[PDB]
Design a protein around this ligand. Structure first.
Ligand SMILES: CSCC[C@@H](NC(=O)CCC(=O)O)C(=O)O
Ligand SMILES: CSCC[C@@H](NC(=O)CCC(=O)O)C(=O)O
Ligand SMILES: CSCC[C@@H](NC(=O)CCC(=O)O)C(=O)O
Ligand SMILES: CSCC[C@@H](NC(=O)CCC(=O)O)C(=O)O
Ligand SMILES: [Mg+2]
Ligand SMILES: [Mg+2]
Ligand SMILES: [Mg+2]
Ligand SMILES: [Mg+2]
Lengths: 368, 367, 368, 367
């Protein structure tokens, strides 16, 4: 393939309900889409960055810039372009995983669409549908939470991920275990909220029988996690720390993680994503698909990813309507708590421009 | 896709020159080829097994029987088929990786050709050509050896690999180093011929600056290699022991290997080969493509695979003529120590029927 | 003395009751038997492969070929043969342990008969009778399972082993523990049915006081076993993975195993099996004798084997009638939960021609 | 098999040339023989103890004693006797392995003869002859030593083993290596004469290419061996320390040994000895048969043992004359640096009564 150009868009989709994390509350999502233009056709790219640098150092505007000025050009200046080759191409640029991911993603979609292959196919899906769970935010109250949860449970969600933070741990958890029962798939996420010194606190959850605890400490603190693993009964799950397959290997080898959360953007692309899956698999480490509150575009790729064999745990692959009233693509609909893997070439999904333009906030064509 | 059937062929191909390993000599090559038949088109697969169970427990007749009786049938029974699904589909049958690998290859070639996609595209290549090394057998004489080596050297072969045995280690090595120099890319392959007890003789090779020692010990002896690794300077490379990505991971983790030889058939498929590649990469373990004296069919797909990013060492991807006077597909020709990655869909090669039919001993339809 | 030839027979025996494991259901047993002919007399070997390659890579058809085309020929080609020399003589041929074990059995029996020695004497028996447990397959219902178990228990079997699988683990265990009590010897066997990710589930059996959990993971997954063991309270026991005494040593050193199941055909013969017994013993790893639904031939060699000092756990050495209404040799009958070690030369048993001829489907003579 | 009784004989044999070790000098060999008697026939046992408790805590008189009062009686009292059962029957008595080993032997010889089976068959011999080495004692002179060595090498011996002592280590070696060459298989044996604190000293032998260094430290000091292995290049070999298969496994596990010397009575019997072999083998640890200056009886059993598969190093299984002009049995005669594995039943050898009588000193019958 030959890269024709990339149209960058800024989108702004308003969340159904504000989603509060250890890093801040969210009322509206500010995304960053990519339209890759080839000889053949075009591909879509979705950047998991957010307004500001609060989950990671990467943020919407930073991405634009790097993309614009560094990334996109690099590829454009290439003869042959293969999503594979994208990586090596961009190698001289340190970091910006979410940005290259999105880029790669756009390219990939084009290529698969040209060979008429689905994402899944490329990634080697074996499954047709995927079990979905949901990620529940920090409530201002119990009942509030108890309610939502029950709500989600009702719609068919198989598992529950509770957002935690100091002061929002044990209680919430205790309360949900209590109401809903013990046969409920339950896990927590601290989005780096704690410290090794908070061990005892997190030790407090031991009793609850959670599947795992996601990123209790900083992104850089692998050893801390391994130590931590030593002090608590809850299986460590790493997110933030998993920036690559190598990273996953390292953390595993160090006994710092038992289950890994896969976020295609975080790791720099669906391809790396696949590798992390592989790596994990080879080490007998279950993996699961993580969510960045994406559109039907990220959601579709995820769903395909998530249908890979080692995804033995329900991912954060919730129905479109969990966050968005109006998706810019055919929405995703829970069905017996599952989501159907997209059968058509590339993502097997595309945006509906009215929907699209209504949400678009800006645009920019980057070309040769 | 939908599997319509598979045509099993037996092929015999005479060697240009007898090929001697620690497991024996070989003047001819019996192979097993597979023709996958879909409503859409064809796909070809090559089996790496040989006449008897000498390199591994797998053998031609053995593969044939399982394919026939178990493997082909289980795929045909499946509604929709994807190379990817092959695995899960044949998972109930334990072992039989070479066979399973051939079939998946057949399936995959079809599937890709259908998506108008190359093996190399699917596998994730980053290059267009690959540097080839050569596997030099055991000689009767040192001079004999030296001519031979020199021979390849002139052909443009990028790296030299010497088959060693007990009684054919150090000297042969001493010889090539001395005669040919310190800058030659040299490594040995014991095809499991040694024991942990022979360490000292192996340590005797420390001085020659070999890139590696390939499978000094038995297939099952991983911790032994790790121990060995602590007794010699020469880096350990595994072939036989690497039956899967998990095998790789295990070995790495245990300190039993530093470099991995990837033999797709051996690991049960090109897809698994990929995974091994990735696994090795993630651990900082260089890989290189191994060879099983295959036809241009296997040769084609291996060149593809040998173009992957982690293949940081010349693999056993010599040119067709190194073994075969006449290949069943368009030959592979060394152009400046390299080989060109195929560009057509699927394998990018196909047997020249005229040529095939000349080397086919048997045939059978499974549909 | 010097191999004259071997007769290969195909035998088919119906099971009094269908047997189900995690790999499938079985109503009839297909075996491979060998009559080794020596100037000094004949010997009988039994191969443990089955129809298809489901417990392992080996299977009847495969064994037969390899024997016929490689192994037998190779022994024929020798000047001298001893059971002990069988290994070295066949070493050039990778794998095919079951086939090899069968051939070595045949040679060894012929040899022991000539010397008028018994298998037990040869192996080092120190006991004249052995405690027998029973292997219970997967049932359609619990109640069903409860009865069966009930019955064996009644027959005087010393321990119960339950075939498990995901979806048939905790309940059945709970039901039996609950119905029969805590004093019974109880263990389970997954036949590689689980993954490392299944630890939490398995960890659920903890409470039942199981003697062990046999081969929860795949054959090649030794490290996982050591990991798993760190995760569960039930002791790990390996079957499929123990393919040799070296295999055993490695697994022991890795902490992957605590109790070893010895299966002669699996490890390449009675001779190898002894080494395994010996290696374990030296590492303080208790062993027990595995079963492969053998006829009186293998049954008898097994009873002998299991009288060895390190076999401190009841084995899968049930009475003939557990599987066969009519055995081809003198039947094995339970007495006070024990089976008597055979005293004659060689196996101490032999087939009853008319009986054997009846189950024979094919026969071939392999000579020079 | 029911044990009728045993005849204990004290035997005194003169050594052709005095034998010096770290623990002393030996001019004359005082053995202890047993004649087991059963309804069917007889079997012979040879005890490796010596006059005093210098190699180990066991000595001729303490052996006789335990045998008389404890061991023997124990076997008489049982209905069914079998070699294998000797262990379990004598297990309540702590230690006294060489003594228990002796009994076991005679019983086994009797048991094997009864079935017309050789010790070799029983043990699992894979070989018909075995490569022999020789153990050379401490000399008074370096030259007197080179002479002796050259003599043994001349006889056709396959390996040289040097007894060493602080004050007789490097020089001796240096000497032999200088004179005889680097191609000779050379090794040394300290008989526990050094301490961890002597490391530097022993490290002094690294340059020499010794195959191994036998029991440098005391019997009970496994850990120190492991440590010492760390500080010297010479491979550690354990003798005294290997009192059993479990002992071997422990030492192996702790890295205190790379090569194991197997001495049947030291470990309490040929049966145990077999396990030891097996255990080592399973850990990739080579073994070799050690010697106790035995008559043709033990010599015979040792030769059979030494033909096992993992005995990949020549043993101290020298020809009969190395110590005795007149062996109480048909003498062992080196041939092509080898000794032939006995073919008869049991030992496949027996004492020449006449001969045996000359050298007998005492004799008691226990029934
Ligand atoms: C608000 S973005 C935080 C990312 C958080 N994501 C979710 O909790 C999942 C939200 C979703 O379903 O996309 C995580 O730690 O993985
Ligand atoms: C003797 S058959 C193959 C065994 C050997 N293979 C080769 O040496 C490569 C030969 C080739 O180029 O195909 C190996 O161990 O890798
Ligand atoms: C054909 S499946 C038999 C394998 C199985 N063996 C048994 O279950 C015991 C049968 C017996 O008692 O012989 C095991 O995995 O341990
Ligand atoms: C005689 S006690 C000293 C034993 C010495 N043995 C020999 O050197 C072997 C002599 C022999 O029996 O051939 C040793 O400790 O290894
Ligand atoms: Mg998270
Ligand atoms: Mg190789
Ligand atoms: Mg089992
Ligand atoms: Mg010694």
């Amino acid at each position: 393939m030959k890269l024709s150009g990339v149209e960058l868009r800024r989108v702004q989709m308003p969340l159904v309900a504000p989603f509060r994390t250890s890093f801040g509350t969210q009322s509206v999502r500010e995304l960053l889409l990519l339209r890759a233009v080839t000889p053949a056709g075009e591909g879509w790219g979705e950047c998991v960055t957010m307004a500001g640098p609060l989950y990671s150092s990467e943020y919407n505007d930073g991405a634009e810039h790097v993309l614009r000025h560094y990334l996109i050009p690099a590829l454009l200046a290439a003869e042959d372009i293969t999503a594979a080759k994208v990586t090596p191409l961009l190698a001289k640029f340190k970091g910006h995983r979410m940005a290259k991911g999105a880029l790669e993603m756009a390219v990939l979609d084009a290529e698969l669409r040209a060979h008429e292959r689905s994402f899944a196919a490329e990634l080697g899906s074996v499954r047709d549908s995927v079990p979905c769970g949901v990620s529940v935010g920090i409530m201002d109250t119990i009942p509030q939470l108890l309610d939502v949860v029950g709500g989600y449970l009702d719609e068919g969600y198989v598992r529950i991920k509770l957002k935690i933070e100091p002061g929002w741990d044990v209680e919430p958890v205790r309360a949900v275990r209590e109401r809903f029962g013990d046969d409920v798939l339950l896990q927590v996420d601290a989005n780096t909220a704690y410290t090794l010194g908070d061990a005892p606190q997190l030790a407090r959850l031991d009793p609850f029988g959670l599947l795992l605890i996601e990123q209790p400490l900083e992104e850089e603190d692998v050893l801390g996690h391994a130590e931590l693993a030593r002090r608590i009964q809850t299986p460590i799950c790493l997110d933030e720390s998993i920036v690559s397959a190598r990273a996953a290997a390292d953390a595993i080898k160090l006994g710092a993680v038992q289950i890994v959360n896969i976020k295609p953007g975080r790791v720099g692309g669906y391809l790396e994503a696949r590798r992390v899956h592989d790596v994990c698999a080879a080490h007998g480490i279950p993996v699961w698909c993580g969510g960045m509150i994406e559109t039907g575009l990220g959601r579709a790729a995820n769903v395909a990813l998530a249908s890979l064999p080692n995804f033995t745990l329900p991912g954060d692959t919730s129905a479109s309507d969990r966050f968005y009233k109006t998706d810019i693509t055919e929405p995703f609909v829970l069905s017996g708590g599952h989501l159907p893997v997209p059968t058509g070439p590339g993502l097997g999904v595309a945006p509906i421009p009215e929907l699209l333009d209504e949400v678009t906030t800006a645009k920019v064509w980057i070309g040769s």
